[PDB]
Amino acid sequence: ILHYEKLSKIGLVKGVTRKYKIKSNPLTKDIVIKMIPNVSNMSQCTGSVMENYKTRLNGILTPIKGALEIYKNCTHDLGVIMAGVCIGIATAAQITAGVALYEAMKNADNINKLKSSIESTNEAVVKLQETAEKTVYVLTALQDYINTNLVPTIDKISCKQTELSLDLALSKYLSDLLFVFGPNLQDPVSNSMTIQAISQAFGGNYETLLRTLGYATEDFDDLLESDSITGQIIYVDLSSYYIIVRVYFPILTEIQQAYIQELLPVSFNNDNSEWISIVPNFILVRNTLISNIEIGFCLITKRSVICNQDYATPMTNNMRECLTGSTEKCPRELVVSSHVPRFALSNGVLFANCISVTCQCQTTGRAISQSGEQTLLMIDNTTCPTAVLGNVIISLGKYLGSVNYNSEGIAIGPPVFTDKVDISSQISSMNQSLQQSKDYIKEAQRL
Amino acid sequence: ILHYEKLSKIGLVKGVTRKYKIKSNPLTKDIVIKMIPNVSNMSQCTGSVMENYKTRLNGILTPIKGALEIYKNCTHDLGVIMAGVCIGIATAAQITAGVALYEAMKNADNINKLKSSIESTNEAVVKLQETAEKTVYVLTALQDYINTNLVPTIDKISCKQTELSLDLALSKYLSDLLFVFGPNLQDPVSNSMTIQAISQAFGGNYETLLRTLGYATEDFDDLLESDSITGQIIYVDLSSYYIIVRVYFPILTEIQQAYIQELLPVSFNNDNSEWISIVPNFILVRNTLISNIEIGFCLITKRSVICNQDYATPMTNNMRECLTGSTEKCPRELVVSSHVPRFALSNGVLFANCISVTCQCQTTGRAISQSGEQTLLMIDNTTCPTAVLGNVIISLGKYLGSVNYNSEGIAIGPPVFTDKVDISSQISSMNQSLQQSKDYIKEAQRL
């Protein structure tokens, strides 16, 4: 419902329209990650390295266990009834997750029954299976390092030296875990954690984890980059040093009667300088309303915008008037920098500033020029079949719009400044003027 | 053209003056990167690993090929004429890049003629050369890993185990590529991509890439950190899994009659509290005008500021009056935190707050004190040859300026608040006051 005809003289050229979709209703898979490697084939020369390693892992995992455990004591079957005075203080998101943690025990319990075989795996990636009821994939951190790089050299490298290499490899691993599972993760109950963070537990190799669980399609890569694929820690075993992680696989749901429209800014002139109109670049339209989108958190594809939550936000009435044609209310900033783009292409048509850009029409050799009455000049193939801007030759299409586009003016709104310091100064200035006028109305009222 | 004499009582002490320079007019070099390793010397035991690897690379590269290819169909030689109705929608930056992509084929074509030898290289870094017309450097991802860590162990590690190690190494590589060449790169035409991102294709080893192409000088390190060195993908070969990358090497051009001046803030007092004056810390001066610079995007050196584009921005008139001496208009914030610095050194002179800092003059043992009439107190070697602030002893120079500096006042501007919440509240407050006054003028007008 935008008036693109008016906006294009202001300097906002219609760009690409995209569809809008948001993550919902996931399916799940459970995977086991071991944080301690199997050192049996080099057990002759591990020194006291593994013992110190185990101690540190308990120090790291103990706070995770304790924190999730409080939402584990404070439920009982009814679905499930959660105890409000037991947890006492919680957010809605935190509560939802605590419920999911409870339901998830059915599987954690069946997985834990396999602990005897989990404890003794000896490969980086292995499938365990005994019954229909209990099967699981197990990933082991650093196992390949040990069986490819240390074990084959046990008869070449002196045992003290192999102890030192194992110790360094383990310390590198802990360093990386600490950025994610260290006390930075002060809330391990919530399920917002991405798979790219969880995978640090296996060396950051999220591809192995995800390929172990599924298969590849182009849509999946979009979900992974849009951060819609997350997981939750459901169980921690401090005696075997492993965690059970639930991975969510979302279904994307598009919003009907909705789209996102982008605009391409072009600087324009009003008097004797260059100016930029300030509007949101991406406008979200739903039904007949216009709202703002915090698109910086959403993956943008050539066809759609994929968000991992609803990012719609409020917009003021002056921007609606701006956008729907009362352009008098559209604010502008001054151009100082030479980096501001001065032209754009839309549907074969050029919108360009020919006061600050050398424009000429190649077909004839005639110059193209802009008077001080136009903001931007519109160039198409009914006036100039082909044209050159700077050093680029562009064939043109036809403007399917008004014929006398370049003959009409548009109202221009006020100058603004957007810098953080400038904003504070503008506030002070307005306040000083308002406070003096308040005293003048008092004198006006008394006399 | 700044009045440093007035600004120093406000709390802004003149710091270092730097030169300003911006990236332009690059020279180029073309390099080939292979995303798939040579596994011939261990071809006996690769399982089906390489086949799955090749499939995933085509899935990753196919969208890059397709996206750049549309600016490849839509040109023909004239320089070159680009088809405006073929591409339809484009930005100026996007168009410029599409032209560069076209011209670049002369070299891509000569490089592609070497595909037979590119396909069969077997080293991490190799030079191919047959003719003057066609030579190229080729970098191969993961090749050293294979010939140093896997191949020498083929007779020690069981073949199934070597297949698993190869698979893990390849999956780690893809994980890293996906942050750059995954569908995050939704526009592979533009040439703004830095070399530090491109180099992820070779394991993030940008030093090997750049040393292969050139030589080292201190100036180069500044260009690399200032992100002025970028490249472009010009060609993708989905049948050999390699890309041809054009690397740009810029010439830095300084701006004449221009400099950047920094100011060092010192808190000061006006009444019974500490205050900080708010100005941009870095001021850009060109000719006789003052403008703001978004220096946070520019490398700062001891001699100059190196930007990879023009970052000059607008400034309000009140800040010009601030800076050129009408200090009544300089806004200030209240100090709450104990972390605010309370002194600075400039050209051997100390500007310090002696109400909140213990100041004394070591040469005599006499205390230095500040009355409530001074903002900051200026201390130099004509009053006190050496002085102590807190626990640091500083010899002093002479103030080459007014002699009675500490005898004169300065106007102080209004209090401000800068917090995001405070800004919203201040706007609401101003609006409520203004709306009530509007009704009062209506009563004043009717009677």
Epitope: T28, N107, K134, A216, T217 | T55
Partner: antibody
Framework: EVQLVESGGGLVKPGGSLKLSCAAS????????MSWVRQTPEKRLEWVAM????????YYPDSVKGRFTISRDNAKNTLYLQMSSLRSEDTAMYYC???????????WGQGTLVTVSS | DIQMTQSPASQSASLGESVTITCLAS??????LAWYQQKPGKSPQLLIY???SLADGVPSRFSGSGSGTKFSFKISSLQAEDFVSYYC?????????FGGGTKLEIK
């Protein structure tokens, strides 16, 4: 209305070959992954093959992997399956189906018939 | 491979009677299971995907639930038009497979 239409069926001598095709209409072809599903005379359903939305990935059961090729032409809105070395084991109805977000089959065509006999 | 067993192969019912069929997975599959209905002379149609949601256009007569290894499908009030074949399939991992199929008869 989604209208998948299979064709190209018929009688093949064992050891022969046959190319099938399924034209699409009523939805955007280029937005969905698709598959072939086989129904035996005994009414057992079997997955035969799938191809992802952009054509970069495909998957097959071991019994047809290496024999069959699944491909798509997005410009023509057409799904193709190239069968080879046909066996009597392959006599069945062949259905063209459109997948949902994972691998449930939301839309099915009428199906065509492939018969292998000497 | 993941396979599942569907049973009873056949059962009878009266019109208006409630009926249930079950599939048992060889290995746990979460809720990654779908149910289909096939009429004679026609292709199968989807009724229930992801174990518990109904497909667009599916009558309220149909419902289902289950997770892990055991899944079930229910018709609360069987119509003459419902005495056809029913199938379950897993979409947990490739190869995707279908169960044997079950048939309702009229008493």
């Amino acid at each position: 209305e989604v209208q998948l239409v299979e064709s190209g069926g018929g009688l093949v001598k064992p050891g022969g070959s046959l190319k099938l095709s399924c034209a699409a209409s009523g939805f955007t072809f280029s937005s969905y992954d698709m598959s072939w599903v086989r129904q035996t005379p005994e009414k057992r359903l079997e997955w035969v093959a799938m191809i992802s939305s952009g054509g970069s990935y495909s998957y097959y059961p071991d019994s047809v992997k290496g024999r069959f090729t699944i491909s798509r032409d997005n410009a023509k809105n057409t799904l193709y399956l190239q069968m080879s070395s046909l066996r009597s084991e392959d006599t069945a109805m062949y259905y063209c189906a459109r997948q949902g977000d994972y691998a449930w089959f939301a839309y099915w065509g009428q199906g065509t018939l492939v018969t292998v006999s000497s | 491979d993941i396979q599942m067993t569907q049973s009873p192969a056949s059962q009878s019912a009266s019109l208006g009677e409630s009926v249930t069929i079950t599939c048992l997975a060889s290995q746990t599959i979460g809720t990654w299971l779908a149910w289909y209905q096939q009429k004679p002379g026609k292709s199968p149609q989807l009724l229930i995907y992801a174990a518990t949601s109904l497909a667009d256009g599916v009558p309220s007569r149909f419902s289902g639930s289950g997770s892990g290894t055991k899944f079930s499908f229910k018709i609360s009030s069987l119509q003459a038009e419902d005495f056809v074949s029913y199938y379950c399939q897993q979409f947990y991992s490739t190869p995707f497979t279908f169960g044997g199929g079950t048939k309702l008869e009229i008493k």
